[PDB]
């Protein structure tokens, strides 16, 4: 019957030993590799991170040179540029147990989500003080010109706990047995240039001299951020168990079957919490801003919409989350504080009933969520 | 005493229970496009269901400006005079906010602490930016073209998302709740050279022939559904529900160079914010035109007398940029401004220049309690 | 045992003096001057309340008096208005002793993005830079007069809830004295070549550049109206018997790629590091770096970084970067405090050195007053 | 179970007694007459009286065919076309249907018997026949031509006038219900040549240059006055009144050639009714793009799998017609659909042809408890 006050129970612990930990513990964060390669080469890369502690995460930084060799032409950045300089991550914990395993603009728009505004940017002010970009932290020129090279740089950061307040999704790894696993597959001349009037949703560059763009090399160095020296007690290592017994994951997927004025949805699976959703409205390679949509809606099983919205109020919500719009067709939901759970409510979907449909047209969606281990 | 320190711990549980059961919704309650030379005044009748937190208002309108030669330009509001004036009554006709729509607009920017549903500019080479003109309006609108302005304005019920002072239980069938909207029409939104732009909307040489070819609008109502019931009924945040949370604007004149113009908070409400537009005859001007601003308490003491550029500095820590020239903002959020407190308590403004028909539009952001 | 009930009850003070007491901002003084016959002076704040830090305004026009050369912006500009301020309480304690400079990149770290500036955003609606609160014209051309504006929060407390740090200066009797000295004519202008670091322009004109004027304004931010309860003004114990101070230094010895190790004192418990790259009048963004880090003997590194990883958190924590050649550290949750006299450095290996090369650090740390 | 059995034969008496007791109503509610081109959509405010059994809205349009030349058809479904979606929502805010103009239309002919509200053709000399108009609209507008049309609908909350299943209490003064009637406008009511013809009411080459010049409608609210009352207040069947009886539509897509399309019955609702509509990418089609139809369980068994003709014979035996092309219709009254019966239950369509935007456009009528 009841003795659900063993969660109850087992939620208070947790919690106390989370504040232990992020108390007692001293956050560090590591370089574990760094390579400089050709991607004509190779472009798929297996790191094993070191195994200390309880790990909550990867900052990769990449860096490229890439000439566009073309006579004539110019290329320019597509809507995700150095965003999809690294095409798919997949991470592995020492149980062998995948967390996230998605694409890198996917990874970075929930970087900037979480952040509040553009990741890693440089806002610009009317300060006199030589504040500004500086840095060039990420940064990739707008336009590569027929015999130039250009430079670019980017960071990613593949998250395992949550935040670094709310370790759940973190993982302990002490077991010199099993490693811990970050694939890396790369953007490579194959998929970096898109010639004019193709699908950019994969490449960095665009433009009538693609075909002659190359790679000089794409250099990358992985980070790790990690607890050490973990408090211990009379029961030994004290540890949140649930937040260690809980996977942090994105992952993204793709649907087709639009048709104009029809609702189109995307059922959300049983089990996963789901924090936050994202939408790209990839019109057969046309990628525009919300003039193809009538609206985007989340519903219930009772045809009752939550937020049925039409897409500049839709993209009005997503303001005051980023401060800015995520780039053409991109939509994002924040669903954090009340994350959609199939069990709380019947079946729950993501909607967008489009106005205009090309052919080829599909919707990438984007997850972040919680779900138990076991 | 014990009576109320118990009904304001009664009041935030039951507003926590809420918060955790219920869950939000927003959605559209009316759209209507029309052309303000037929009619510029709309009466909305929201939807009565659960706690009812506030409205968000799309507004999307073209302009032409058929003038031969001469071209406007947006007045340092611009679309925020897309609409005049908004009033809401809730189900037993009692009034919440009634204000001017550039005031509702500059508080939406205070609450947000940044200009109102605004895209920032960032170094970010990934293409974000202003993608989807939430809020857009031409900065000219040369002679013989048309532009197109879109604007939002959040009408609150509720303080904020997570403290429901001030929003409205709706659940009785046969009471309906009243959300007047009054747009600008082709009298109010275009400014000739020389003329007041206070009100207007575009500026310039070609004024006399701008026109309006049409507004829309639509209205979605944010409100909590599934009220949490228990033993007893509906759990609700008593006090929330019976306190109202308003904005309502004024006009005070009187000003003359080098003398404290005080504006009494002359009611017994709870002051949460305070702006004072100096609209000196139809100039605006940044701080130039004042000597210092403060608040002021009976005590004839001051507790911010600050010169103009400090006044702005306090203000940039809010909203991370100033507010546009001649007004002026005053946080008094944590601590409100309630006359019975200490003595009577004025907004003072001393002038260093004063032109004919100056005076300081006031717009006060309080709580208040019904009875 | 103890300390539990002691912060705890420091905690429960603070709150009752934050919920009864009343906030006031009060200007103190103002003055206007011309460096060539002054710029050091000793400002003497009001003995009332509990007392949480100072807004200095100050304000100058520049004249560039040469025949035909500009000068233009260094990278401080006008935080070099300022060149440095010392606060001492009552008791003849100091609190801050640091250069204007820091202050201002401490002020920018707290804000969580460039202190008292003007975001841009594509707002149709006309907010904006439209009262020029921090503000100075990018060049003065020869025969051009500048107007100039800047403002520094000089800390007592640590923040408007945090007052850890605030002085009591209710009753201390005794006066405070805040210490400014400014920009004068010897050090707010740097010719083509000179080190520009603790000037505001630079330039081909800068020989024949001079202060036409400079004004200051200081207001005071405290708390009156202070609780009293039984044993008579409830007060946060702790908070107000901790000091909350800027400081700064200098260090020099700097080798390409070998580790320049700065070390952190004992007592202190270090809320943040600044370290700016002088590298012999030469401000350059990370390229003449291998990488920086914090690090405890025998426990390595907790972050070594290159450059742009570095400045990558930084980013995180304003929103934008610092200046060329300043790099900055948080360390506010967890403090660097070391019970042994440099069981912790700040490092910096650098990939090239010039002739005069230097680490000009800065720090923000709390620290008992016994 | 004695619990259950009890409380259905107390259910029953009640209604029985609230029958012979209360004495039938039907008054009007509200009547309005406007331009869509200015406002489509209303929020009609019932009055609070006694038991609600449903409303009767009566619609009456004027459109003018301006084309220079070409003339406009009805669609398929015409006049059933003029209100789009109707939503009710009673006054404890629970929604209860929520549907299109045109299913609900269907729904009100299957209750019937025949194509609701029609006149039957005779041969009988006596001068009966479309007397009053009462559902009618001219076959085609010619170009430079107005045509007058009249439309009603029966909104349902009680199941039928003699089972009161899905009824509403409204004796609650100030807790309001509400009928929303969103109708057409020229965007949605006149279709090019070659256009979907789906919610369209006239449908030719001269559709660009159509446009309503008004629209009317009255609604008339029925209910059941002088409710008894006995030992205990008033007798009142409590599962007919905590039940809703609603109708609801969505739209399926990813038809092949060939392949069972399914639409599993997905919610635990007591479905009485199911409207499969082949909107074959804008084609309608009288059965020849679908080799059969079937109610399936997950047993994999069919209840009725039948090619179209056999489908539409039973149809017809249901309201002495057939529906328009394309619209298939499934009785399940005696025996509602309830998947905690037996496994899932699917309804299913196997197309002989698919067109590009083919879809599947699902009407239920179904029964579902409060809680």
């Known amino acids: ?51 200390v502690g309880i790990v909550k995460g990867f900052l990769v930084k990449v860096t490229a040179a890439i000439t566009n060799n073309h ?56 300060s006199p003080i030589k504040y500004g970009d500086v840095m060039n932290v990420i940064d990739a020129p707008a336009t590569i010109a027929a015999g ?112 104009p004025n029809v609702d189109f949805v995307v059922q959300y699976a049983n089990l996963y919490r789901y924090l936050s959703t994202i939408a790209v409205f990839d019109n057969g390679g046309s990628f525009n801003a919300g003039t193809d949509i009538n609206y985007l809606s989340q519903r219930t099983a009772n045809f009752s919409d939550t937020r049925k919205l039409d897409p500049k109020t839709w993209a009005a919500q997503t303001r005051r989350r980023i401060a800015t719009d995520f780039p053409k067709g991109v939509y994002y939901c924040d669903n954090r504080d009340k994350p959609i759970y199939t069990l709380q409510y019947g079946n729950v979907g993501f909607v967008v009933n489009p106005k205009t449909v090309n052919q080829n047209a599909r919707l990438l969606m984007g997850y972040e969520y919680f779900t138990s281990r076991t």
């Open 1 to 51: 019957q009841q003795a659900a006050l063993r969660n109850q129970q087992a939620m208070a612990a947790n919690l106390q030993a989370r504040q232990i930990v992020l108390q007692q513990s001293y956050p560090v964060i590591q370089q574990v590799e760094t390579q400089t390669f050709d991607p004509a080469n190779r472009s798929v890369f297996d790191v094993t991170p070191a195994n």
């Open 148 to 259: 130039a090279t250009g430079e670019l740089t980017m960071y990613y950061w593949v998250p395992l706990a949550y935040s670094e307040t709310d370790l759940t999704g973190a993982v302990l790894a002490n077991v010199p047995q099993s490693k811990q696993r970050l694939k890396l597959e790369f953007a490579n001349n194959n998929t970096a240039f898109a010639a004019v009037g193709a699908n950019p949703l994969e490449a960095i560059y665009q433009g009538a001299g693609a075909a002659d763009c190359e790679f000089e090399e794409i250099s990358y160095t992985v980070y790790q951020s990690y607890l050490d020296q973990l408090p211990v007690g009379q029961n030994g290592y004290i540890l949140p168990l649930i937040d260690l017994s809980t996977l942090y994951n994105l992952e993204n997927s793709a649907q087709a079957g639009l048709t």
């Open 71 to 126: 006579a004539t032409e110019a290329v320019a950045l597509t809507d995700f540029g150095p965003a999809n300089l690294v095409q798919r991550v997949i991470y592995y914990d020492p149980d062998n147990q995948r967390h996230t395993e998605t694409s890198g603009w996917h990874l970075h728009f929930v970087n900037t989500a979480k952040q509040g505004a553009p990741f890693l940017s440089s806002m610009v002010t009317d």
